[model samples]
Target: FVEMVDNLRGKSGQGYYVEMTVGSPPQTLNILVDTGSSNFAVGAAPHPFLHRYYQRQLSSTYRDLRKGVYVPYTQGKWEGELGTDLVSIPHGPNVTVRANIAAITESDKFFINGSNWEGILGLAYAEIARPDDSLEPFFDSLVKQTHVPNLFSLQLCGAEVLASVGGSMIIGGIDHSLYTGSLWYTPIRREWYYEVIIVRVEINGQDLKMDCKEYNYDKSIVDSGTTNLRLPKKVFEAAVKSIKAASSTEKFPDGFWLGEQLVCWQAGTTPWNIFPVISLYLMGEVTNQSFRITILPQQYLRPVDDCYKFAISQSSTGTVMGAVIMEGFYVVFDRARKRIGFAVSACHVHDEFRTAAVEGPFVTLDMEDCGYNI
Candidate 1:
């Protein structure tokens, strides 16, 4: 049987988290499931964004590792005390494991205001685990202790919906019922961030026209935590230009593409119809194989209080197929097999629009599945 987690709470394009019990008496708290990060940390001290802090002294099984852990993110930073505690999922997995957890003493924007989750459970590998590799991450400990399979899958249900879709995180194996169609496997480019390569891009079935190398500049990752789909500088510009070339909108402004402004339309006005379809050609198991996964306009032109913002942004540092893209598919991180899989999510919409789509084992006689272009 698969270990399943329900009650995946929070807004998509923002973040989503599940509840986990920690300590001896079991302090049940909401933990953000972030594939992009690798630290299992909880707020231990007073923080404005936190509902409550983990009091290590109350737990009999808690052991202070006496090491300081400081993790920095693209938006937030946190300093914490390293420690070990008995951790287990309340509604999902049966096994309880003694896991390394960061007791956050000080934090900034790490815990955003109006947040439901108290801690962040980084699902990435130990390569980016806090306080170095010797500090085994929570999932690593879970695998070592229970002998579960080194794989987990996630489905995010908050794309074009007004309410939370209530997605689930299935651990140890795939939940066949969560998705439809054959799962396409893409080789995990690295163990650190579940990185993948986008070999090509298309707007309204038309090529965006750029070299393969530009798509994966500084590494492309699938991160549920990141709010937007981040692309490389040139690729982002090209994609925007292509969007403009194919758009049916009469008054397209320059500020929207530059990440400077939001386009607020009158009530009941939908912008998704005016926008064209966008596709990302992801590299497959070999250099010769490629898959075309297209996302609906509902995924990129995001809703914000009757207004919409272009959710895809240009990042000079790296490329990220973040929350916007993840909402469209049921993703599996098959670490043991050294590849990730994608399938159409059960939560995908057919009500307003048909989203969460994928196609092709198209031939890409490319040079390589580029991880990072220097």
Candidate 2:
């Protein structure tokens, strides 16, 4: 039961719309699911380039939301207008799901020149949930109002189970076939992310000494908005030294080229004074394998080439898990239960999750799984 989300193309309205259920009329919104972000929101306007006069190519509807749109952020704060209009989207029932839509002010930061985006459905930490409010991320509002399980499944291509030669986001309900592990609930962090306490850490079979056992009580977020696993700078440096000590050379599968110095070694070698296994123990029963994992060695050392210097962006070198490391994993985020789960992703589960998609013009759906594929 991979939940399919409707899509919303940006500049040209050319991409797939993801499927999502939101609002009072149970209005089903077709959105572009962005995990790398934390805001769960929808846009309120149209772009100037969706018109033929702009490029003289394919002509589409255009609107000047000089009245309704705005740039919310301060630094990147833009002055855009809202173009509130009813659009249709197709979820899967052969009918289109419709919902309110908006356009953004044409700017260089955004691809308004008929590029690839219209507006954004922020599912990140850009905004906050108000105490008396109920409309921020209309989805969050709906979840609080309806109390139904809000589940998200993203299946891309190249997995054993499903392939996303087609792409999209799936919302609501877990697929029995795709989900195999138990759900573990943790505490939600207050600072714009679902946070979890680091219960314990283990390398291979040995438990590493805690620099600050009380520090584990501090919450770290489960940010899909980010692509990789973020650890503390001290922890990150320590992990690197540990891995290097274990392996003589790093080995990667032919296609996936990480770097020259990624530590690769046969299993069972002792790396550092600590063990080689990385385990992250979450609240409840969720225990994830954390360390003991190796990386392409070249990735560790800075290159002589300045171009590649920016390959790894460090936020003061504290540590962040990026996409390269999270290539084949399935992460489950549950807001209602205040829990997040992760698994090794048997077969092509991650790939299949990545391919879940929904198309549209903005139709809407009824209750249950019955959606209009309009």
Candidate 3:
């Protein structure tokens, strides 16, 4: 089973000491370690309408080492050259790591104005990656520089909405208390995301299968950048229908805010009765990766209105397994080796109603709605 706890950074790994320089002497800023994205930028302090929790510590003699590198975001953007600096982290030692200290100003849309977290550490692979997406994360960049394979795993304690709040990013393997069951892996593609091929899905006892041929996107981007599985809407619709056809949808006293509808049900009426197994095959050279992770047993959840599948994600992209199934698995990312690992176990799925913002008008158009998949 999966283990859970509060939003704590008590986990261990070779972390980085990310520092931000505003002026000459160089002032240190608090930052969250992220491996899902490759850029290392900070939220500008003293900006109007900025998150006040993030504090600004001004320093003199700021380092303008790079020529020019601009960073862009949804709300605002920053332009700075990537440079390495000797920095100190709260729980880590002082070391030199590649970072993009913002030299210009932008809008306020990130974790800014805090003494603790001035900005975020993007762990996802971006088109314009800093220090390269294949390198070890900033915290553990030492391992990558030493030609060692860095393993990154995340134990997001809550649902998608609140995952950023309570969840944690583990640099190496997990600790004993948080670990339960075996580590099963699904094969990953060798693109920016290391996308995986989902073999076929079986519900209860019925044979409802869809292959890669059915839904094809670039297999290269199996990523952490997007919260949604980002599948072609057809895949989601078909998967939902196939599951519904196998069983009835159970309504719960509460629902998660995962940007989609969620329903759960018992496995099926199969006489043999093996907890329904949805097999995602990897067509790559390492096809055996899927065997490493285990499926969620019927008893994993509480007696929620008679066994039902509280889907973590009803939709997924043609390339990724996303968080719905991600909860049941341990995702280990080796940044140095440019390899991603998956191991499955039973994990607690926390309710994240408070941390989420929802609106019908704000929702983006689905692939089908754009007439792309039609």
Candidate 4:
């Protein structure tokens, strides 16, 4: 049965978490909904940052799988022991499974003092599962045990618009009310990381003068957990130059483009009007067709310290379409069909006082689809 889990909580760039019931007799913990990787991990040992952690001794259903789990994030990383426990989603499907979980004993920035989520709930494929790909991810187990359709959808309420408001995770069904128009789906290029293909990038209506291969130098992926829209080094430079040329600003700092600095403007300073709309050309449903997904200044630039920080950054690995991109659309992980879908999120259009904008599935001139391997 398709179940709508509304307990999803958290901000866009920061994170989105949900209440997860783990162990027998139910030990509820706040877990971050992360789609970039595949591992259901929680804090087991006491730490100053943790308010509470999983007490394995209390659950009769808990059994140590006795494997080491080490997953790395940009800032934080954890090394923990793998275990199996009776796990169920409180507000989700009723089926319970003996799921694999990482009992983190020691960690770094994965948790902070008084942080919101107890751990992360990885929603990606099994290929990236720590220890080995043989280990099925939490969602994979859920699907096998419950016989639900192999798809789920998301609506991430960003900080700029109703930051405090919670979004939802719809398992096995789509809530048409949250979005408008037909969903545009891009083929899942690879099972791991929800990797897709990007052929080009545009500003306003003009394409950036660069090779499309740079857009997928290593690969292009849609990661819900990544807080920013990260670009390849070459692509980032080209974008910064084009944005500065079009922007009203006479002089700009490299620090800002380098993702190291945030430039503050005086109050009443308007930045959005100066920046152009950025678009990404993704490989479409056909072998040769492609479509575009665009984000406005509101999605690419965030208010930090009430100062402006570019939500776009440089990725040494590959292009990561993160919150800056996802927040603009209602994204779906359609595992059944091996594709990912995007539609305009209704919440984005406030009737914006000039704040929200994400438009397209705009058809590009027919060209042979490239960058699938590159």
Candidate 5:
């Protein structure tokens, strides 16, 4: 088992950096943990004092692939050299996983804002990786090389800047104690993403009440890399109506865009209780085994210095259950089983456990029959 502990330290409260040592002398670097993309790349220049850029010359284990890579994202892009190195996560105990990575030579202005973390470690499936599955992801390599379990769990601790914080990423197994109750599992309809069926959405106990057929709704991708909850246009409109009815009119300004989908409101403190609870219904292969993933008002509403901003907005590309919805739950990704699991997260600094008893036993599937090659 390999476990890595990370702290949320970015200015936007969106990124979590884990300690990773690359090279023979083991130069430690802070890598942003991302689930939306699947390419591990490190910056050539260090922004924060503690984390350093990846120096290939310093490590005898480094191998020059002599290939160029360009990684583009919604916010920015990174271009660099493709290479391989010996990467080790700090213990369960002292496990080293040799994997392919990119040495980023240049970046755009979009990445400049998040330079606090030296690099990005993508944890998605290999299909999303560059050259169309030419290289395996770090986690996949770890399991195959080290004979470790093909599962990982993420507990993202939510906090204010400079507040008490602790979050963890377990790369081999689940920390049962970090979450309460049974873990609800869902089968993956596609291997490309951490995708699941989002049967319907409800606002303040009332269904968003739209026909799923009109939007061609079947699944929603749970992306930890995204900060806001992005919903379809019609679903967002319904949520806006419910939000306005719950909160006072003065709390929300006439119109301004916060991000692409979010609307900026006049800054002010809005009581969390006033915001309505939004519920998302998630379905598994078995109809009787469905689950309800509820987003509490406090979880979906961001408190700025003077105003409260809604964390969800319109998505032109189907539903995306981003960080806002993920903050309340402990999530596990089981690549071997081709399934994902979720349970209520234990929300405290000392509540995390190194090991715990597994409960609600996993519902395993025959991957070959499910078209899963891994």
Candidate 6:
């Protein structure tokens, strides 16, 4: 069982990075730990300023596959060449796993803002991968090559804009101390992503009354890499209204002004408990069972220095259970059973939501709108 604590860092409150040793003689690189996408690549030539890149020439084990790769994101795209090397997570007992790596050629400006970490280590399934879609993810390769269990657990310490702020990621085993209560499990709707069925959403005990037919598709993606939770347009509007009615004074009625997007505020001037609790109901495909995860105001609202601002935004494609909501639960990606497990995390009491900009127009183009998935 290989487990190492990740110190959350980066200018954006969403950053979480860990040390990964790559190549023959082992050149340790800081990698952004992400579950949203899968592709392990380091910045290469003409490297983004001040960013440490994977030096292919310095490693004896590095072998170029002669394959070009490109990964797209809402922020930007990363273009590079695919290759193979030895990757290791070091702590007390280090475990090394041989896997594919990308020698990044270029990246967009916004992506370069993630400078705290040199590159990204994608933990999701490889189906959504681009350029070289046939490659196996690092975690999948580790499970098959090593004696490690087919389980990966994540415990985010909250949105802190600094490094080593107390978070851990376990590769093969579970950390029983990070969470309480029995773990709830749900089957993955599809293999491409950690997609699940969100049966319903409630604010202040009232359902959001989303369109059941239009919402019939895979409801949401449990993504730890994202900073805020995103809901559909109508759902977001409804939730904001419910929260406003429950809050003290309709102070920021139209929502707090954050430049282009308006973030709604709750009752109290600074206290978190005054805000309403949002609940999400999820159902499993195989078991025909349902489970609910509650989101406290502290988990859904960012503490902007003194006042609280809503973290959820309107989306065009689907819901995203981003870091805001995930920090409230201990999440497990069970590749072996084709399911995901969740338990309440230690941050259930920790006030981790700091300051950050509200994201959106939060939309993804539909098939008819863009002729392709966005």
For each candidate in turn, the TM-score is: 0.93, 0.53, 0.59, 0.90, 0.83, 0.83
Which runs of model 5 end up more than 4 angstroms from their true locations? 1-12, 46-51, 91-93, 110-115, 160-165, 213-219, 255-270, 305-307, 348-374
Give the Å shift of residue 235 in candidate 4: 0.5
lDDT (tens digit, per residue) of candidate 4 on 156-211 = 76753424436778887777887887688788988988889887788877888576
Q: Which ten residues in a row have the lowest lDDT in candidate 4?
A: 349-358
Query: Per-residue CA lDDT of candidate 1, range 39-152, in tens?
Result: 899999887788887999999999988899888877779999998999998766778999999999998777877667889898888888877877787788889899789998
Every candidate's CA RMSD: 2.4, 12.8, 10.6, 2.9, 6.0, 6.6
Residue pairs with backbone overlap in model 6: 7-164, 248-267, 256-263
- Model 2 TM-score, 2 decimals: 0.53
lDDT-better candidate, 1 vs 3: 1
Model 3 vs. true fold: TM: 0.59
Best candidate according to TM-score: 1
* lDDT: worst 10-residue window of model 2: 352-361
User: What is residue 281's positional error in candidate 4, in angstroms?
Assistant: 1.5
lDDT of 2 by residue, 1-374 (tens): 32342222221112223544433223344454444343333433344543311221111333333444344442244443432222323452222222223333344444334333333454433244322122244345334445445655443212121112223344454444543344334444343544444444444435455543332323344543343455665554455455444542543332222232333334434122222334444433222222112223222222221211111222332334333332333445555455555444332221211221111112222111111111
User: If both were scored by lDDT, which would come out higher, candidate 3 or candidate 5?
Assistant: 5
Task: Estimate the lDDT of model 3.
Answer: 0.40
TM accuracy, model 4: 0.90
**lDDT tens digits by residue: candidate 6, 202-282:** 777687776533343325678877767887666666777788778765356453522133443354345565567787766
Which structure is stronger by lDDT: 3 or 4? 4
By TM-score, the candidates rank as 1, 4, 6, 5, 3, 2
Q: What residue runs in model 1 are displaced by over 4 Å at the alpha carbon?
A: 1-5, 159-165, 351-354, 367-369
Task: List model 5 lDDT by residue over 69-164, tens digit each.
Answer: 887766677688888899986643357878898888877753544446677788888888985687888888888889778887788776543333
